Amino acid sequence: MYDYLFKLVLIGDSGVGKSNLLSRFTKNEFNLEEFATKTTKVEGKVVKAQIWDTTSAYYRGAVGALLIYDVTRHATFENAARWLRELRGHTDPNIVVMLIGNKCDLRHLVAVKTEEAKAFAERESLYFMETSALDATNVENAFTEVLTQIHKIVS
């Protein structure tokens, strides 16, 4: 069956691409108009990720999280702070967190610049990569580095 059942959660404001980050990783499908499962071999061991996407029951058990904002809407990145506050009051301290700037294929509507976000993420000690669920930029290995950082910690 599997070796680990890693629970991940997805948080972000309305319409930053959470649902499509989930369907792009789990199903390779992107919808131009809740918990998903994938199983992958992280460092030999089979891992079955249960990936939640929108309250105690939401967070509890989560070994990992992806804080997602929308590159073209600066207000959704400002709210990464209130989100990080809610996350940390509900999960184990040593949860793997990755700041995610999605819709990075809208290169000319970027309202949140990378070094801005790389600065906040290093202050709050997060991992960070910009993604596109539309054309699958960095979707896969983002999830596989969250799940690989978690496997690092549990051994």
Ligand X SMILES: Nc1nc2c(ncn2[C@@H]2O[C@H](COP(=O)(O)OP(=O)(O)O)[C@@H](O)[C@H]2O)c(=O)[nH]1
CA distance 94 to 100: 18
CB of 6 or CB of 69, closer to ligand X? 69
CB of 16 or CB of 142, closer to ligand X? 16
Question: Is 30 within 8 Å of 22 (Cβ atoms)?
Answer: no
108 touches ligand X by CB under 6 A: no
Least separation in angstroms between residue 25's CB and Mg ion is 14
Residues annotated in a binding site: 12-19, 53-54, 102-105, 132-133
Contacting ligand X (CB under 6 A), which of 9, 102, 121, 150? 102
Token pair 């990720």: residue: 49
> Which of positions 11-30 make contact with ligand X (CB under 6 A)?
12, 14-20
CA distance 134 to 71: 13
Q: Which residues make beta-bridge pairs with 130?
A: 101
Q: Which residues bind ligand X (CB under 6 A)?
A: 12, 14-20, 32, 102-103, 105-106, 132-134
